[PDB]
UniProtKB/Swiss-Prot annotation, chains A, B:
Changing residue 4 to N: In GASC; found also in a patient with Costello syndrome; exhibits only minor alterations in its in vitro biochemical behavior compared to wild-type protein. Interacts with PHLPP. Interacts (active GTP-bound form preferentially) with RGS14. Interacts (when farnesylated) with PDE6D; this promotes dissociation from the cell membrane. Interacts with SOS1. Interacts (when farnesylated) with GPR31. Interacts with RAP1GDS1. Interacts (active GTP-bound form) with both SHOC2 and PP1c (all isoforms) to form a tertiary complex; SHOC2 and PP1c preferably bind M-Ras/MRAS, but they also bind K-Ras/KRAS, N-Ras/NRAS and H-Ras/HRAS. Interacts (GTP-bound form) with MAPKAP1/SIN1; inhibiting K-Ras/KRAS activity. This is GTPase KRas. InterPro entries: P-loop_NTPase, Small_GTP-bd, Small_GTPase, Small_GTPase_Ras-type. Changing residue 12 to R: In pylocytic astrocytoma; somatic mutation; increase activation of the Ras pathway. Changing residue 33 to R: In CFC2; characterized by a defective GTPase-activating protein sensitivity and a strongly reduced interaction with effectors. It catalyses: GTP + H2O = GDP + phosphate + H(+). It is a lipid-anchor. Disulfide bonds: none annotated.
Amino acid sequence: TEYKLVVVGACGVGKSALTIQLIQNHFVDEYDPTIEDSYRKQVVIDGETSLLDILDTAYMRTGEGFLLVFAINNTKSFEDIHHYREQIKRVKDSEDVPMVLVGNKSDLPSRTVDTKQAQDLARSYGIPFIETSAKTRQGVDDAFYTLVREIRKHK
Amino acid sequence: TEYKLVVVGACGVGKSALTIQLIQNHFVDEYDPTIEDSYRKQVVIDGETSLLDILDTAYMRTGEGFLLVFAINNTKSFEDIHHYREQIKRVKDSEDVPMVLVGNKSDLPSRTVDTKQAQDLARSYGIPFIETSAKTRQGVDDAFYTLVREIRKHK
Ligand SMILES: Nc1nc2c(ncn2[C@@H]2O[C@H](COP(=O)(O)OP(=O)(O)O)[C@@H](O)[C@H]2O)c(=O)[nH]1
Ligand SMILES: Nc1nc2c(ncn2[C@@H]2O[C@H](COP(=O)(O)OP(=O)(O)O)[C@@H](O)[C@H]2O)c(=O)[nH]1
Ligand SMILES: [Mg+2]
Ligand SMILES: [Mg+2]
Ligand SMILES: [Mg+2]
Ligand SMILES: [Mg+2]
């Protein structure tokens, strides 16, 4: 009932925004990118009281679940996804580590990374893909909760 | 060729969900209830290129069409329908304003407001009644498009 989650991705994709929206239920219009802190919150996932220990990157090997986050209006971030994917494989020494691909900023119309690209990437990793928006709370809880559901399976 | 539409109803009925599903063609599992923003999208209604200016309540007097939205699994929302109905009559100072009654969340089985009650209410207002689901896109376009068709006959 206690989970250690880790949010990874390129700078400016909304790693901090997604975390704060989950923890403090509000949207941050700006957040210091050099800040890397762990956050804590007792929540209810699928009716079960769970403790979430989330690390907003800017221990790693103590992570049970990982959020691969990019922005749908940021091609470069999507390109950097594989870099972080492989880091997690090495730090965990495993092929099968609970992960979720996250497409943030789905509220923005200036989309450059279409659905097929993201879903093909997730298909190449065999992990779920969720479109999120930290501004509007869209898919935010689902992203973290799905990861926890992935951990439940592995454990 | 341009239309100003206003979506009203009780909190949590899916006003935001119905708007996003129309504009960005996706479903929001959660949306900040305190967010009231105007949205814009050029669409094709019955073959005719139209610009839709939609206000998602949480400007009013400039509304040409109004969506009266409740949830079929929300008796209270249905009860509050007349409240918003009369507000629009006052803000427009008119006895005849293009409106459409919308029963959202039709994808849910836990129904408490049957078709009889809704249709009887729509008949009491002399306006169309549309069953919608922002989750599955059911009746979403038809709801907004019908309202536009109501504006057409009105002018
Ligand atoms: N429109 C929109 N903007 C976002 C969203 N998430 C984050 N942002 C913006 O992106 C900027 C950088 O986000 P941040 O969380 O600091 O990126 P980080 O480097 O991964 O921590 C912030 O100023 C946010 O306002 C979102 O879902 N929608
Ligand atoms: N099953 C289902 N859920 C919906 C539908 N429309 C909205 N919802 C859910 O209802 C919740 C609140 O909807 P929202 O649009 O924020 O209500 P608002 O206060 O009118 O803006 C959201 O978390 C949606 O997931 C629908 O058609 N079907
Ligand atoms: Mg940050
Ligand atoms: Mg491209
Ligand atoms: Mg809303
Ligand atoms: Mg009854």
